[PDB]
Amino acid sequence: MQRYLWQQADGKRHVYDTARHRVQAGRPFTALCGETVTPQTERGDLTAGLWFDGECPVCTIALAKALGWPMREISDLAHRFDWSPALITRLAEVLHCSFGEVVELTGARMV
Ligand SMILES: [Cl-]
Ligand SMILES: [Cl-]
Ligand SMILES: [Cl-]
Ligand SMILES: [Cl-]
Ligand SMILES: [Cl-]
Ligand SMILES: [Cl-]
Ligand SMILES: [Cl-]
Ligand SMILES: [Zn+2]
């Protein structure tokens, strides 16, 4: 079984640690980004062919980091998401570098 897998829940496609959680409709799990979420059939969460929500930016970057990417390649990745203060400060709780380093990584406030 792979260590990390994707699962849509609460409006985004999150990543979870399969050594920590088993996914099931109506059961909460906590994603790599730290949000505790519950897959719901009404949101299309239990049919992966119907997963139309956008990827969770925090989980996507957390997964790249967990997989050992250098900061420069993680930075290229992050550039394709929109980063609100909620998301940026959530990513800073996951990464171990300085908050300024997180903000620079996201490319979120740079033209
Ligand atoms: Cl298992
Ligand atoms: Cl592993
Ligand atoms: Cl949980
Ligand atoms: Cl939820
Ligand atoms: Cl809803
Ligand atoms: Cl579903
Ligand atoms: Cl986005
Ligand atoms: Zn997430």
Number of domains in the chain: 2
Q: Which residues, listed in sequence order, are joined to residue 36 by a DSSP beta bridge? A: 30
Question: What is the Cα–Cα distance from 13 to 7, expressed in whole angstroms?
Answer: 6
Q: Which residues, listed in sequence order, are joined to residue 9 by a DSSP beta bridge? A: 12
Question: What is the Cα–Cα distance from 30 to 94, expressed in whole angstroms?
Answer: 13
Q: Does 64 lie in the same domain as 39?
A: no
Q: Does 106 lie in the same domain as 73?
A: yes
Q: Which of 8, 82, 10 is nearest to 52 (CA)?
A: 8
Q: Give me ligand 5 centre to Cα 69, in Å.
A: 34
Contact status, residue 102 vs residue 95, Cβ threshold 8 Å:
yes
Q: Give me ligand 1 centre to Cα 58, in Å.
A: 25
For tokens 């300085």, the residue is: 98
Q: Does 102 lie in the same domain as 77?
A: yes
Range of the domain at 107: 56-111
Residues with CB under 5 A from ligand 2 (ion): 3
Question: What is the Cα–Cα distance from 46 to 31, expressed in whole angstroms?
Answer: 16
State this model's resolution in angstroms. 1.9
